[PDB]
A = this chain, B = another copy of it.
Amino acid sequence: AKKDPNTIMSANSSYANGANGSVTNLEIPAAFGYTPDFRYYHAAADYTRRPTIAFLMELPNCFKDTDDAAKWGGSLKALIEMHSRTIDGLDYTLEVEHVETPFGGGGEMMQTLSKVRRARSVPVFTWVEKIGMPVSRFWNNYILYFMGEPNSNVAGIIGKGGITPAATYPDYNTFSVLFVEPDPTERYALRSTLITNMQPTGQGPEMRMSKDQTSSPEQLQISQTFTGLQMVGRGVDKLGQMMLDRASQTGIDLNAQPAFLSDREADVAARTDGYIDQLVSSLSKPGVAI
């Protein structure tokens, strides 16, 4: 219950510049020297990765031309943010490349810096199907109407007369999403990525059929890959911290939440053949006395 005052960086600067939460100090002794010191054990606590949060930032403009844009844009938000069973493919690792020339005939070489490059994100979402197959229809009809249609390679929405030109630009049929890795307390954001130009790519939903009456019915899982252009930096971290400043947890308490039933059903009260009924009506109430 007492740490070294220098365990935590007093202010975030240099390589910690732009960080949000508390950053541990590196210039305090570690455990892998001559011997470890028990006076600095509060500084050995390790980092553990937490799940990523997805925020919808933009909607395709094609939703507007539909008969109901509200439900298209609400369903997309719910699928991105709530129904997402898993997310994957997010990577922005660096890459350094050198060139070589021998420093004599012995075998040694001199290495000179050449270039630095960065990775590319390939978002993958996964969902679990529900009654009525809303997910399969949502994505299939999205592709069919707002993207190419296989037998003509033309969007099926253009069958309406009045769609404006400039419908081939990404703003018509693409959206954007912001991904945030939060703190264990979920108050500060440690990693972030702002991907845009996102729309389905490659294989669509499953869409296979079969007959076997002796087998057991099985579920359906949706796997979807997307496209994207990503930005990383400090402005994106500030954007993520602004996002996570919202969604505050002050006040809530799961232990103190009310139960989802306030009281027994009315039909149950009309049966009079339970535990409480025997006490209320069946047993004689003569009273207790000396």
Contacts and interface: CB of A to CB of B under 8 A. Distances in A.
Interface string A178-215: 00000000000000000000000000000000000100
A275 interface: yes
A278 interface: yes
Contacts of A254: 149, 151-152, 156
A33 B250 contact: no
Interface size class of A (residues with CB under 8 A): 20 to 34
Contacts of A159: 249-253
A205 to B, nearest CB: 15
A47 interface: no
Given A149-B255, A255-B144, A279 B34 contact: yes
Interface string A139-158: 00000100001011010101
Given A156-B255, A213-B32, A273-B27, A37 B282 contact: yes
A49 interface: no
A117 interface: no
A96 interface: no
A145 to B, nearest CB: 8
A245 to B, nearest CB: 12
27 contacts: A27-B273, A29-B273, A29-B278, A32-B213, A33-B275, A33-B278, A34-B278, A34-B279, A34-B283, A35-B278, A35-B283, A37-B278, A37-B283, A144-B255, A149-B254, A151-B254, A152-B254, A154-B249, A156-B253, A156-B254, A158-B249, A159-B249, A159-B252, A159-B253, A161-B248, A161-B250, A161-B251
